[PDB]
């Protein structure tokens, strides 16, 4: 939900360490800069994309 | 002095499908590793 001059918090999943991705909110796009770090576990108990 | 002359009688104790009650093995001590799983199995009776 949007109104006017505000902000929004979103949860995202990625595999890359250096992630430069575009998020399409409604009909307009925004560039996101992220420097993701490695997790503590090497083997996981659920599948992913 | 008899060919195939015979009679027939109904018999007790017939076979019927019922339900058996069993138990479930106890959880094993599980420890995770690099692409491997370790299980410490403690069976009370022969468990598959």
Q: Do the Cβ atoms of A34 and A21 come closer than 8 Å?
A: yes
Cβ distance A41 to B34 less than 8 Å, yes or no, reads no
CA dihedral A16, A22, A26, A27 (to 10 degrees): -150
Resolution (A): 5.0
B27 Cβ neighbours under 8 A, 6+ residues apart: none
What are the C-alpha distances in Å from A23 to residues A11, A30, B12, B38, B40?
Answer: 12, 5, 77, 42, 47
Q: How was this one solved?
A: cryo-EM
Of the residues A38, A39, A42, the best mutation for testing chain B's interface (the one with the most B CB atoms within 10 Å of its CB) is A42
């Amino acid at each position: 939900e949007v109104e006017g001059n505000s902000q929004l918090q979103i949860s995202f999943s990625t595999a890359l360490a250096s992630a430069e991705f575009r998020v399409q909110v409604c009909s307009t796009q925004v560039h996101c800069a992220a420097e993701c770090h490695p997790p503590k576990d090497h083997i996981v108990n659920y599948p992913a994309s | 002095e008899l060919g195939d002359r015979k009679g027939k009688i109904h018999i007790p104790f017939p076979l019927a499908n019922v339900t058996c009650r069993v138990p479930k093995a106890r959880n094993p001590t599980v420890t995770y590793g690099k692409n491997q799983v370790i299980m410490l199995l403690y069976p009370d009776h022969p468990t598959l």
